Structures are given as structure tokens and as C-alpha cells.
Write a protein that holds these residues in place. Structure first.
Motif, mmCIF file in Angstrom:
data_model
loop_
_atom_site.group_PDB
_atom_site.id
_atom_site.type_symbol
_atom_site.label_atom_id
_atom_site.label_comp_id
_atom_site.label_asym_id
_atom_site.label_seq_id
_atom_site.Cartn_x
_atom_site.Cartn_y
_atom_site.Cartn_z
ATOM 1 N N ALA A 20 0.880 -1.184 0.000
ATOM 2 C CA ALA A 20 0.000 0.000 0.000
ATOM 3 C C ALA A 20 0.906 1.220 0.000
ATOM 4 O O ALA A 20 1.671 1.403 0.978
ATOM 5 N N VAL A 21 0.862 1.988 -1.079
ATOM 6 C CA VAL A 21 1.548 3.303 -1.139
ATOM 7 C C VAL A 21 0.526 4.325 -0.643
ATOM 8 O O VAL A 21 -0.525 4.473 -1.302
ATOM 9 N N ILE A 22 0.815 4.975 0.482
ATOM 10 C CA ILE A 22 -0.068 5.998 1.089
ATOM 11 C C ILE A 22 0.460 7.346 0.618
ATOM 12 O O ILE A 22 1.569 7.731 1.037
ATOM 13 N N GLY A 23 -0.310 8.003 -0.244
ATOM 14 C CA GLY A 23 0.095 9.246 -0.911
ATOM 15 C C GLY A 23 0.577 8.946 -2.314
ATOM 16 O O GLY A 23 1.033 7.816 -2.593
ATOM 17 N N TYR A 24 0.378 9.885 -3.214
ATOM 18 C CA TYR A 24 0.729 9.712 -4.636
ATOM 19 C C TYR A 24 1.370 11.011 -5.107
ATOM 20 O O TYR A 24 1.101 11.469 -6.207
ATOM 21 N N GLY A 25 2.194 11.580 -4.231
ATOM 22 C CA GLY A 25 2.917 12.832 -4.458
ATOM 23 C C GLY A 25 4.260 12.570 -5.096
ATOM 24 O O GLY A 25 4.408 11.594 -5.847
ATOM 25 N N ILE A 26 5.229 13.412 -4.776
ATOM 26 C CA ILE A 26 6.567 13.394 -5.436
ATOM 27 C C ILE A 26 7.176 11.997 -5.243
ATOM 28 O O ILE A 26 7.564 11.367 -6.254
ATOM 29 N N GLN A 27 7.195 11.489 -4.005
ATOM 30 C CA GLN A 27 7.748 10.141 -3.717
ATOM 31 C C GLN A 27 6.706 9.059 -4.022
ATOM 32 O O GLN A 27 7.102 8.040 -4.645
ATOM 33 N N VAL A 69 -4.541 0.261 3.701
ATOM 34 C CA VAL A 69 -3.766 -0.319 4.834
ATOM 35 C C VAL A 69 -4.361 -1.683 5.206
ATOM 36 O O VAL A 69 -3.585 -2.609 5.448
ATOM 37 N N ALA A 70 -5.687 -1.800 5.256
ATOM 38 C CA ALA A 70 -6.363 -3.033 5.721
ATOM 39 C C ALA A 70 -6.052 -4.173 4.743
ATOM 40 O O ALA A 70 -6.082 -5.328 5.170
ATOM 41 N N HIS A 71 -5.709 -3.859 3.489
ATOM 42 C CA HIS A 71 -5.474 -4.876 2.430
ATOM 43 C C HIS A 71 -3.993 -4.956 2.049
ATOM 44 O O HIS A 71 -3.714 -5.448 0.947
ATOM 45 N N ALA A 72 -3.078 -4.575 2.944
ATOM 46 C CA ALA A 72 -1.631 -4.498 2.627
ATOM 47 C C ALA A 72 -0.780 -5.276 3.633
ATOM 48 O O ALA A 72 -1.131 -5.304 4.830
ATOM 49 N N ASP A 73 0.328 -5.841 3.143
ATOM 50 C CA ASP A 73 1.381 -6.502 3.962
ATOM 51 C C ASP A 73 2.488 -5.517 4.323
ATOM 52 O O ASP A 73 3.120 -5.680 5.386
ATOM 53 N N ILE A 74 2.723 -4.549 3.445
ATOM 54 C CA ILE A 74 3.731 -3.474 3.633
ATOM 55 C C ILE A 74 3.051 -2.146 3.307
ATOM 56 O O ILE A 74 2.357 -2.059 2.260
ATOM 57 N N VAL A 75 3.256 -1.157 4.168
ATOM 58 C CA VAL A 75 2.621 0.182 4.047
ATOM 59 C C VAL A 75 3.735 1.224 3.946
ATOM 60 O O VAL A 75 4.561 1.276 4.858
ATOM 61 N N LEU A 76 3.745 2.021 2.875
ATOM 62 C CA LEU A 76 4.713 3.144 2.708
ATOM 63 C C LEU A 76 3.974 4.471 2.943
ATOM 64 O O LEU A 76 3.083 4.809 2.159
ATOM 65 N N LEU A 77 4.335 5.197 4.002
ATOM 66 C CA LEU A 77 3.655 6.455 4.398
ATOM 67 C C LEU A 77 4.342 7.624 3.687
ATOM 68 O O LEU A 77 5.260 8.226 4.250
ATOM 69 N N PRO A 94 -5.016 1.434 13.506
ATOM 70 C CA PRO A 94 -6.160 0.533 13.684
ATOM 71 C C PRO A 94 -6.302 -0.557 12.611
ATOM 72 O O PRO A 94 -7.025 -1.490 12.866
ATOM 73 N N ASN A 95 -5.625 -0.425 11.463
ATOM 74 C CA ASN A 95 -5.862 -1.283 10.268
ATOM 75 C C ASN A 95 -4.608 -2.070 9.865
ATOM 76 O O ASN A 95 -4.704 -2.905 8.943
ATOM 77 N N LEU A 96 -3.483 -1.839 10.537
ATOM 78 C CA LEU A 96 -2.195 -2.493 10.199
ATOM 79 C C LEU A 96 -2.274 -3.951 10.680
ATOM 80 O O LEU A 96 -2.468 -4.173 11.897
ATOM 81 N N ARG A 97 -2.173 -4.901 9.748
ATOM 82 C CA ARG A 97 -2.244 -6.364 10.018
ATOM 83 C C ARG A 97 -1.077 -6.791 10.918
ATOM 84 O O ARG A 97 -0.020 -6.134 10.868
ATOM 85 N N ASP A 98 -1.264 -7.859 11.697
ATOM 86 C CA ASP A 98 -0.178 -8.509 12.478
ATOM 87 C C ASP A 98 0.969 -8.855 11.527
ATOM 88 O O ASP A 98 0.694 -9.426 10.457
ATOM 89 N N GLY A 99 2.208 -8.538 11.902
ATOM 90 C CA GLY A 99 3.388 -8.842 11.066
ATOM 91 C C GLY A 99 3.552 -7.906 9.877
ATOM 92 O O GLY A 99 4.515 -8.097 9.125
ATOM 93 N N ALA A 100 2.668 -6.922 9.674
ATOM 94 C CA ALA A 100 2.821 -5.942 8.570
ATOM 95 C C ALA A 100 4.009 -5.027 8.877
ATOM 96 O O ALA A 100 4.380 -4.881 10.072
ATOM 97 N N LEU A 101 4.605 -4.472 7.818
ATOM 98 C CA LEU A 101 5.732 -3.513 7.889
ATOM 99 C C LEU A 101 5.214 -2.127 7.508
ATOM 100 O O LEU A 101 4.591 -1.987 6.429
ATOM 101 N N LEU A 102 5.486 -1.133 8.352
ATOM 102 C CA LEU A 102 5.231 0.291 8.041
ATOM 103 C C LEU A 102 6.590 0.948 7.802
ATOM 104 O O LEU A 102 7.500 0.745 8.640
ATOM 105 N N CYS A 103 6.732 1.656 6.683
ATOM 106 C CA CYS A 103 7.955 2.413 6.319
ATOM 107 C C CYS A 103 7.642 3.896 6.201
ATOM 108 O O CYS A 103 6.628 4.239 5.576
ATOM 109 N N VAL A 104 8.567 4.725 6.674
ATOM 110 C CA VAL A 104 8.582 6.187 6.389
ATOM 111 C C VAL A 104 9.814 6.489 5.533
ATOM 112 O O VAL A 104 10.768 5.662 5.529
ATOM 113 N N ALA A 105 9.795 7.614 4.817
ATOM 114 C CA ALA A 105 10.898 8.011 3.906
ATOM 115 C C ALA A 105 11.693 9.182 4.475
ATOM 116 O O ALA A 105 12.523 9.749 3.740
ATOM 117 N N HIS A 106 11.496 9.475 5.756
ATOM 118 C CA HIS A 106 12.176 10.561 6.502
ATOM 119 C C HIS A 106 12.001 10.264 7.980
ATOM 120 O O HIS A 106 10.896 9.792 8.352
#
Ligand SMILES: NC(=O)C1=CN([C@@H]2O[C@H](COP(=O)(O)OP(=O)(O)OC[C@H]3O[C@@H](n4cnc5c(N)ncnc54)[C@H](O)[C@@H]3O)[C@@H](O)[C@H]2O)C=CC1
Ligand SMILES: NC(=O)C1=CN([C@@H]2O[C@H](COP(=O)(O)OP(=O)(O)OC[C@H]3O[C@@H](n4cnc5c(N)ncnc54)[C@H](O)[C@@H]3O)[C@@H](O)[C@H]2O)C=CC1
Ligand SMILES: C[S+](C)CC/C(O)=C(/O)C(=O)O
Ligand SMILES: C[S+](C)CC/C(O)=C(/O)C(=O)O
Ligand SMILES: [Mg+2]
Ligand SMILES: [Mg+2]
Ligand SMILES: [Mg+2]
Ligand SMILES: [Mg+2]
Lengths: 339, 345
Positions: A20-27, A69-77, A94-106
Motif C-alpha cells: 500500500a503506497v499511502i500518498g501519490y505525491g513526489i515520492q 492499509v487493511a489490504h496491505a502486507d507493507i505500508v509506505l507512508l 487501527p488497520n495495520l495487520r499482524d506482522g505488517a511492515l510500516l515504512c517512512v521516507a524521513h
């Protein structure tokens, strides 16, 4: 230092997984485009704005952030840093699955505690050293830009290979992905934005203004300080071979003798002192407080600063020079559609 | 301003004429390559050094300078500026045909009186705003870099169209070729080399030095200040759309807020005062006298400065970063060989 190239990463950890790519901006647009072209299952989570429609126009599966987020294994914020706290608390946590990875770019939202480790989940930083258009253009040419990474929380014990799999799919391992703590990345990144970038443009502008004052043709003055592309070519070639080496290889003896007359002698003590003061503002939380105040408006003060900058003599001269001289460009239409 | 593009110039004035490229260095190699690929009769005049052999390796007709000049209608003097006087007096002036055109790529030798108008001959400046490799790469992509031109002496009355024909053949009219006096070009060009280029590298180096002093990872410091290519991409994209515009378009709101906290506020008055001091040294002849001194023993002092600069912390860090991170490059092998293009190109 731990530096990972293609030989040190694989797409295997992304097999059967949805990003799941969260945001569709420059990155976000660059991550979404490169993940899709690398054969990774990708969907976009976005609020109701122009970026939602752009993601639809570019063939993506687009929904609100919570549903992505509810349908993702990896989430990029990949939204602006001041927006991380509210989106994290309401839409992500509230929607991040057990064992899911959340990444930030800063690292900034991690330093401020607006994004935090969650029990049962992984948390990481993958911070590109480049803006989106070149990440996308490099990717299509089989090239990449560098990135820094940090594993903040690793419930699964698989966060490192999953972060580096994303980095390979987006192309950063083609240059190199180096371990760097999220706190150091935050302060280093902000320093480039607050000291180096404005000092560099201020120096170019100072050259322009002194030449115009002293009776030089304003178009010629603008061309020499950056408008010709020459000084940008020197800086980009310098990334390859070294800045002094560009002068040694590509400069006339006249150029080299003049350059070495003044090399190490052009700047007052005030420049090094300002660098230290900017780091004090960053490390001590002063910039973070300023950013929070600036965001509290949907960035009204920044809109005014952007409009005022276009009226500066350098930017008036830029428009005159660009209208009169053709600059080499490549067509950008459809850049982010599927290869 | 008088700005010539492709529709303002033609190759007609080069029909039945031979161009002698004098020198095969950074500019000479690019001019000779682009002239050949544009279908222009070109020959190279060079002394007995490595550049003579390079011109031969790259397929050119190469001779000594006097012979090249004696057999040419247009002569491009593309050797170091301090060498112009001796080569002009001994090799060029006695061999330049009636009605021939001599061109320089920098005004300095004209300002110093080392190159002078000759009765019955034409004299001009065509001064590219770019170094050789990008001139060549742009040419092969159907693009060009800007140039300034000036007609100094015009016995024939045809110097302007012959200079602009050379500029079209080499690619400069694809961007724009603007009229600018040779004396102004000299001072403006030297100012970019003596104020702006060293101040930009000094600033990058200062950012690197403060970050390392403040405990930052030296590879990461080097990458952010230029090594990643990000700051060079911003300056090159800036040439297209504007430097403040690159930040407005490509910066996160975090980046934009930080940039505009300091934009127009970073530099004290000592910077513009030093810029004026460098311009005084250029306009008043001080740099020209320094350059003549430095050209002693074939630029021995410059060789020392070049070697010493390689060992500065920034350049030691550069070598460590470049060994650890792959940088996107295009192959340069054969770039200056003849470039026959297929139908698709
Ligand atoms: N811009 C760049 O090239 C780089 C940015 N980064 C980081 O990447 C992240 C993304 O930054 P950019 O792509 O520059 O941002 P951007 O300004 O392009 O962000 C636009 C996107 O954010 C979304 N968005 C904006 N406000 C929102 C809100 N209140 N709630 C939800 N979504 C919202 C928009 O719908 C759109 O999808 C940031 O953390 C930034 O620090 C780091 C490396 C380079
Ligand atoms: N380097 C550049 O990209 C630019 C240079 N120019 C001008 O172009 C001209 C050529 O400069 P570069 O190509 O940088 O020089 P360079 O340093 O590459 O010159 C090398 C060439 O000069 C010849 N040469 C050197 N000393 C000589 C001597 N004493 N007698 C005869 N030939 C000699 C060599 O044999 C070789 O062919 C200069 O007037 C320079 O100001 C202007 C625009 C940009
Ligand atoms: C790196 S650049 C400023 C050198 C190429 C250039 O434009 C010159 O005028 C010269 O070399 O003398
Ligand atoms: C012109 S660049 C420094 C902007 C892209 C970049 O690297 C960032 O960190 C950001 O936008 O926040
Ligand atoms: Mg950055
Ligand atoms: Mg020069
Ligand atoms: Mg120049
Ligand atoms: Mg940033």
C-alpha cells in the motif's frame, strides 16, 4: 558502514505480498510506478484530492487510506511529515495487520513520536537521497539513486529483507542503500534543505546581482550563474568524478588558474557559523516547532513565500532567458504509466 | 538582445570552404567532431603532443598549425589563451589567406592585444557557455548549448554569416547564440571561474566539514552536499524551470518550509563585496598579469594546486563514497568518433 547493492537484496520477500503506497505525491508516484513495473502487487491509499484522480488516471487501484492499509502486507507512508500523526492514529494503526511492515521516507515523524512502534508489527525508514522524477527516469534506464535505511522495530525478524526488497524494486540498490539511524537522517536531510540549498541559490543570485549592477547583460549574467546549465553540469559531473576534478579535466588553463586563485578563499567565517546555527535549530527542536506552526494553516505562509520568490530579479530574468534560449529537455508525458 | 537560433543561420556560407581547428583539447575536439558530423570540410592543426595523436586516432586530417592555416578559409584558435600571442605571430598571421576568418572562443587574447585584426581578413569570437563533453553529447541528441558571438573585424562583410554557420554546424543555434562584446565576454567568463565556481565548491565543502565536525557519517555528509547527485540535479533542472521553482515542484512541504526559512537570508555583505573585488582584479588587469606569471614553466604552480586539491578531506571522502556507491554514467568510449545516424535517429 553497511551498504546494500542489488547482490545483497532480492524481490523474494515481496512474493504474494501487497504494498500500500499511502500518498501519490513526489515520492508516492515514483514508488507506485517502479513497484508496479518490478512486478510487485501495489495499491494506492489517498484522500479526496487531485492525487487520487491522478493515481486512477495512471491505472492504479486507488481507495481511502484505511482500506489500502487493511489490504496491505507493507505500508509506505509517503505524505507530508506534519500529516503523519493524524493519519497514523486514525487510518494506519487501527488497520495495520499482524506482522505488517510500516515504512517512512524521513526520520522526522519518528523523532517527534508522531509515528511509533506497534506491538506485533515492523517499523522502518527507507529515505531516498533524490526527488521523484529522477528516481523514475533512473529506474527506466536501469539506474538508481542512493537511499538510507533503519530498522526501528522488527517483530517478525524479517523487516530488514522486506525493506531491502522494496529498495531493490524501486531501484535504490542499483546505487547503494546504507544503514543510517532515523534521527541522524532527520537532522542531515533538514540541514541540506535549510543551510545548503538556500545558501547555494543565494550564492548564484549574488553572482547574478553583482554582474547586473556592474553593467553586464542580464541574460548573459543569468546564463553564466546557472541558466546555461554549465554550473549544474559541473555539480552533477562532480558527483561522478569530484568537483575539483571537473575543473582539472574540463577547464581551460585560464579557468583552472582563476579557480585555484580563489578556491578555499571565497567565503567569510559567517558561512561555517550559519551552518552550526542551522544544526542547533534542527537538533534542539526549534525547526520542528516552526514547521508545526507553518503547517497549522495548510501552509499559508509558504504559499506567500513561494509567490514572493517568483518576483525576485533572478526569477524575472529566468523567465526572459528561458523564453529566448531553448534548454535541452526530454518529454515527461506518460512517465509514470506502466512500462 | 540579438539571439540567433537555427532559423537565423545556415550552412550555405561553409559550402566549398575548409575549417582549420587549431588545437584538439576540450573545445577543439568538440568543434572538430560536430563540424565533421555536420558535413563540413575540417582539418586539425596541432603541435607534436598527445592531442596530435588523439586527433589522428579519431580519424581527422592532422598537420602542424602553419600548414592547417595555409589551407583553410576559416581558422578556429582553440588552444590555451596564454599561448595565442606566440602562435598568432609565428603560425597564423603569416599563413592566413586573404578574406579568411579567424575565430577565438574567449575574448582574453583580444583584450590583451595578443590576437589583433589583420588587413584583408576577418576576426570574430564564438564563445560556448559549456565545456566540451556536454557540447558533444547535446549535439548527438539533436540539442545544443548557448554561445556568445562578436564580429571584431569584417574585411569581407560576410564574417557574421560565416561565424553563425560555424555555430549552427557545432549545435549552439539549437539553444541560442547571442551578440555580446568580446571584452564583456572576457570579464563575465573569468568572473564565473574566479567568484562563482570556487564559492559553490567552497560552500559544498563547508557543509561537508561542519557535518563531519558535528559527528555525522562522512559518506552521508558527502552524499547530501553533492555526492548523491541531488544538488546537481536541482541546479540542472533549475536551468530549465528556475531554482525556487524546483523546490516548489519537487520539495516536500517540510523541505519547502525549511528552504524558505533561510532563502535570501544566508549570506552576509562580505560575499557580494568579495565578488566585486574579484571583478576589480579581472577588469583592471591584475588577473591577466597573474595568469602570465602562472603560465611559467608550463603551469608548474597549477599542477601543484591540482595534486594538493585531490588530498583535501572532501576529495578523500569523494573517493570513499564513489567506491561504495554506484553513480549513473553514460559510456564515453568513441564519443568524438564520426557519428553516422540511422533512419530512426
Ligand atoms: N519530495 C521528495 O522528493 C522526498 C520526500 N521525502 C519524504 O517522503 C514523504 C512524502 O513527501 P512528498 O512526496 O514530497 O510529499 P507531497 O507534498 O508530494 O505529498 C502529496 C501527497 O500527500 C497527500 N497528503 C497531503 N496532505 C495530506 C493529509 N493531511 N492527509 C493525507 N494525505 C495527505 C496528498 O494526497 C498526496 O498524495 C515525506 O515524509 C517526505 O519527507 C523524502 C525523500 C525525498
Ligand atoms: N575548456 C572549455 O570548455 C572552454 C574553453 N574555451 C576557450 O577555448 C580555448 C581552448 O581552451 P581549452 O580547449 O580548454 O584548452 P586545452 O587546455 O584543452 O588545450 C589543449 C590544446 O592546446 C594545445 N596547446 C597547448 N599549448 C600550446 C602551445 N603552446 N602552442 C600550441 N598549441 C598548444 C594542445 O596541443 C591541445 O591541442 C581557449 O581560448 C579557452 O578559453 C571557452 C569556452 C569553454
Ligand atoms: C567548469 S567550466 C566553468 C570550464 C569551461 C568554460 O566554460 C570556460 O570558459 C573555460 O574552461 O575556460
Ligand atoms: C530539492 S531536494 C533537497 C527535495 C527532495 C528531498 O531530498 C527531500 O528530503 C524533501 O523534499 O523533503
Ligand atoms: Mg532529502
Ligand atoms: Mg573560460
Ligand atoms: Mg566559460
Ligand atoms: Mg527532506
Amino acid at each position: 558502514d553497511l551498504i546494500y547493492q542489488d547482490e545483497h537484496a532480492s524481490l523474494q520477500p515481496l512474493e504474494g505480498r501487497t504494498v500500500a503506497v499511502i500518498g501519490y505525491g513526489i515520492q508516492g508516484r515514483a514508488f507506485a510506478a517502479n513497484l508496479r513495473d518490478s512486478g510487485v502487487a501495489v495499491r494506492v491509499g489517498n484522500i479526496d484530492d487531485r492525487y487520487f484522480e491522478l493515481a486512477r488516471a495512471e491505472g492504479h487501484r486507488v481507495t481511502n487510506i484505511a482500506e489500502a492499509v487493511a489490504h496491505a502486507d507493507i505500508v509506505l507512508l509517503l505524505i507530508p511529515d506534519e500529516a503523519h500523526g493524524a493519519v497514523f492514529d486514525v487510518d494506519i494503526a487501527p488497520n495495520l495487520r499482524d506482522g505488517a511492515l510500516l515504512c517512512v521516507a524521513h526520520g522526522h515523524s519518528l523523532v517527534q513520536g508522531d509515528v511509533r512502534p506497534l506491538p506485533g508489527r515492523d517499523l522502518a525508514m527507507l529515505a531516498p537521497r533524490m526527488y521523484g522524477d529522477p528516481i523514475r527516469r533512473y529506474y527506466l534506464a536501469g539506474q538508481g539513486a542512493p537511499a538510507y535505511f533503519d530498522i526501528v522495530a522488527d517483530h517478525t525478524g524479517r523487516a530488514r529483507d522486506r525493506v531491502l526488497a522494496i529498495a531493490r524494486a524501486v531501484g535504490f540498490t542499483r546505487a547503494g542503500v546504507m544503514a543510517l539511524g532515523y534521527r541522524q537522517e532527520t537532522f542531515l536531510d533538514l540541514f541540506q534543505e535549510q543551510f545548503l540549498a538556500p545558501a547555494l541559490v543565494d550564492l548564484v543570485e549574488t553572482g547574478f546581482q553583482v554582474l547586473v549592477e556592474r553593467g553586464f547583460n542580464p541574460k548573459a549574467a543569468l546564463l553564466e550563474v546557472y541558466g546555461s546549465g554549465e554550473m549544474g553540469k559541473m555539480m552533477l559531473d562532480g558527483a561522478d568524478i569530484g568537483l575539483d576534478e571537473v575543473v582539472a579535466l574540463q577547464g581551460s588553463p585560464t579557468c583552472q588558474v582563476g579557480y585555484h586563485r580563489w578556491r578555499g578563499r571565497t567565503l567569510p567565517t559567517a558561512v561555517r557559523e550559519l551552518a552550526a546555527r542551522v544544526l542547533d535549530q534542527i537538533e534542539g527542536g526549534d525547526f520542528s516547532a516552526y514547521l508545526k506552526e507553518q503547517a497549522s494553516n495548510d501552509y499559508a505562509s509558504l504559499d506567500d513565500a513561494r509567490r514572493a520568490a517568483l518576483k525576485r530579479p533572478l526569477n524575472v530574468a529566468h523567465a526572459q532567458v528561458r523564453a529566448a534560449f531553448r534548454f535541452p529537455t526530454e518529454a515527461a508525458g506518460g512517465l509514470y504509466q506502466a512500462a
